[PDB]
């Protein structure tokens, strides 16, 4: 009524997410409705989430998709952070599944196509949601899916795994509940598989009152497939809800499935025909140097993308690092003494994780790599070698640093 922030009058609370409270914002002059997420400055600094909130704003500011909540502006005050974003009248997808009996295969497919398109956009921009559920998926007046709550989201790095257990237990992947390292996209596919089941069946595939009993069901990966569900959609759900993340389906696999292909619009995915004419590919950043120049880049990229055989492919066995059957304390003691002989400087991050460095005598530049000890099956350990990005050759300098370490060990 009286409370105003950037010409917007704050109304009733829409709900509370992972970080901060979300409230309705009606315009004082027009009456236009926006969603305002209030992040308390003291609450952020007390939880060491200053870096997480920074990445959250930076991503949403550059994120442009019709199935992801658009962030208009962010207002900073000396005590709070006001995130002004797109408002959707339809509410939660969870409420739609609860109000109706079961969402029909004609409408459930359309909603899933919109969800996966937004999920794929995140993954292509190196962002993994980690908290996908019908409660987090929103709906509008025109019945379109909208992705919200990027609080538990994280950035995907080259050669780096994620450990943080994020999301609801019913929607969490078997690797998430176990507390083990994962790549990222495979977790979102599992979560999307639960949403697809929830839309068609009306219930959850893994549901139990007892917490460890529920965890046992996810690890097992056994779920009921109803008689009203066709054979085509049944195979898709089984491939999406795989215990093994390697055997689990990908966005490219779902897009190629016969059930998903049905009535799929040509503007949702980048490889489709209508995408290049309706969606901006952000080529303006590369075409900023010196009107027809933009269309030249899009056409050249299309010819290169079409010829898959020209850029991509359709004896002794290789292995990652070095394997040892001895105790973890003995392996770590062996690596420290081997480095002193070669005159190396190392930064300690963890008991098994080491940030190592050396100086090249010919070029003069510093050579740095990251070491990490992993656990294989049982009683067997693996030492991992990973090159750090920041006259000679960077890749050759990394291979030589590894070669001297393996020989000394």
């Amino acid at each position: 009524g009286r409370v105003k922030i950037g010409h917007y009058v704050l109304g009733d609370t829409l709900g509370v997410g992972t970080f901060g409270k979300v409230k309705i914002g009606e315009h004082q002059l027009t009456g236009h409705k926006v969603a305002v997420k209030i992040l308390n400055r003291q609450k952020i600094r007390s939880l060491d989430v200053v870096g997480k909130i920074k990445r959250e704003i930076q991503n949403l500011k550059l994120f442009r998709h019709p199935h992801i909540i658009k962030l208009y502006q962010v207002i900073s005050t000396p005590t709070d952070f006001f995130m002004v974003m797109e408002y959707v009248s339809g509410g939660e997808l969870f409420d739609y599944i609860c109000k109706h009996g079961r969402v029909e295969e004609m409408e459930a497919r359309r909603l899933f196509q919109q969800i996966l398109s937004a999920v794929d956009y995140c993954h292509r921009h190196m962002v993994v949601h980690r908290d996908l559920k019908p409660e987090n998926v929103l709906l509008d007046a025109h019945m379109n899916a909208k992705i919200a709550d990027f609080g538990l989201s994280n950035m995907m790095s080259d050669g780096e795994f994620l450990r943080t257990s994020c999301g609801s237990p019913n929607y969490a992947a078997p690797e998430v509940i176990s507390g083990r390292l994962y790549a990222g996209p495979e977790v979102d596919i599992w979560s999307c598989g639960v949403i697809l089941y929830a839309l068609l069946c009306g219930t959850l595939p893994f549901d139990d009152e007892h917490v460890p009993t529920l965890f046992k069901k996810i690890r097992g990966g056994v779920f009921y497939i109803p008689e009203y569900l066709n054979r085509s959609v049944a195979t898709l759900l089984m491939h999406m809800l795989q215990v093994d993340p390697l055997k689990r389906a990908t966005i490219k696999d779902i897009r190629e499935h016969e059930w998903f292909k049905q009535g799929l619009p040509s503007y949702l995915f980048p490889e489709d025909p209508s995408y290049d004419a309706n969606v901006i590919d952000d080529e303006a950043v590369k075409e900023v140097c010196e009107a027809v120049a933009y269309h030249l880049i899009i056409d050249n990229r299309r010819i290169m993308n079409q010829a898959s055989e020209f850029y991509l492919a359709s004896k002794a066995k290789w292995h990652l690092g070095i394997r040892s059957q001895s105790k973890p304390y003995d392996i770590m003691a062996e690596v420290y003494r081997a480095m002193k002989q070669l005159d190396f400087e190392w930064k300690v991050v963890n008991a098994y994780h080491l940030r190592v460095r050396r100086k090249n005598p010919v070029t003069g530049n510093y050579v740095k790599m990251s070491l990490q000890l992993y656990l294989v099956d049982n009683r067997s350990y693996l030492l991992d070698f990973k090159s750090i990005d920041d006259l000679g050759s960077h890749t050759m300098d990394f291979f030589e640093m590894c070669a001297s370490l393996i020989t000394t060990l």
Binding site: I303, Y311, S393, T395
Partner: protein, 298 residues
């Protein structure tokens, strides 16, 4: 005129595959191990890294294996001691004692026109793409990769008058003093012509007077693959016997045939050369990827 403007605008980066394999050899590595590694990995050439100098010195090709065999082979009874014991650095030492070689390379940011010019001018078939920022070798650029890339953009640009003209009228390729081999010619004799004449392939002719097969430089790695390198006294037909079963006939083109037909034939068959023929069956010359690329540059 039209294709010259295309190559000047497009960078070397556009040709590099999305996910490619690169084999690199250290100079201190034994030469025998290097040729065996080329077969197992399925690569035709590999850049050479000098550990002491901390820089890429050159390229190890099949020509190096041909040069070792012809210079050191004595008999099928006595083993080639130099091939068995020599390192890459030691082999290069005697090879560069006559004339040394500064590394010929292209930047990924440099235009495609400069890359084609660098291949024809230096008379080389393989050019390594090295990033000046990191110093890492990214991809080995060939004449085959450039022509296949240009074939993708033939519809995007308007076709000039020369593309609809016959090979006779254009006169592209070698038509005089073509180095050829007989069907009973031993491997050692054939290797000697590769060193003396500095050619890449030799057409095989029978006693009747007809081109039966073609003995190229790539056919030499089979001697290292099957470990039959120690006996170079054997005929050229016995050396080509490994791929003779799948073989139908060596690819040919006519003088009256248009330039567009010749370019399309080389990219589809994925071969490096075409035999020029008159009327029914008369050899006139050899047209290769290097001859076609030079015509689009000059």
């Amino acid at each position: 005129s039209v294709y010259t403007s295309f190559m000047k605008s497009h960078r070397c980066y556009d040709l590099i595959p999305t996910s490619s394999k690169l084999v690199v050899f250290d100079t201190s590595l034994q030469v025998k191990k290097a040729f065996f590694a080329l077969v197992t990995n399925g690569v035709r050439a590999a850049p050479l890294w000098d550990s002491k100098k901390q820089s890429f010195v050159g390229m190890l090709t099949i020509t190096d294996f041909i040069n070792i065999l012809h210079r050191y082979y004595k008999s099928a009874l006595v083993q080639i001691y130099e091939l068995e014991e020599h390192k890459i650095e030691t082999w290069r030492e005697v090879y560069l004692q006559d004339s040394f070689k500064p590394l010929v390379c292209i930047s990924p940011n440099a235009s495609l026109f400069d890359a084609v010019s660098s291949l024809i001018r230096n008379k080389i078939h393989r050019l390594p793409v090295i990033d000046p920022e990191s110093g890492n070798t990214l991809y080995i650029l060939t004449h085959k990769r450039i022509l296949k890339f240009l074939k993708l953009f033939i519809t995007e640009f308007p076709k000039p008058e020369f593309m609809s003209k016959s090979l006779e009228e254009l006169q592209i390729g070698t038509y005089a003093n073509i180095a050829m081999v007989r069907t009973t010619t031993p491997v050692y004799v054939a290797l000697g012509i590769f060193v003396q004449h500095r050619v890449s392939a030799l057409p095989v002719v029978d006693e009747k007077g007809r081109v039966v097969d073609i003995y190229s430089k790539f056919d030499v790695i089979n001697l290292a693959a099957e470990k039959t390198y120690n006996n170079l006294d054997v005929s050229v037909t016995k050396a080509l016997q490994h791929r003779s079963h799948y073989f139908e006939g060596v690819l040919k083109c006519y003088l009256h045939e248009t330039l567009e037909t010749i370019i399309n034939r080389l990219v589809e068959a994925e071969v490096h050369r075409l035999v020029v023929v008159d009327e029914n069956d008369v050899v006139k010359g050899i047209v290769s990827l290097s001859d076609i690329l030079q015509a689009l540059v000059l």
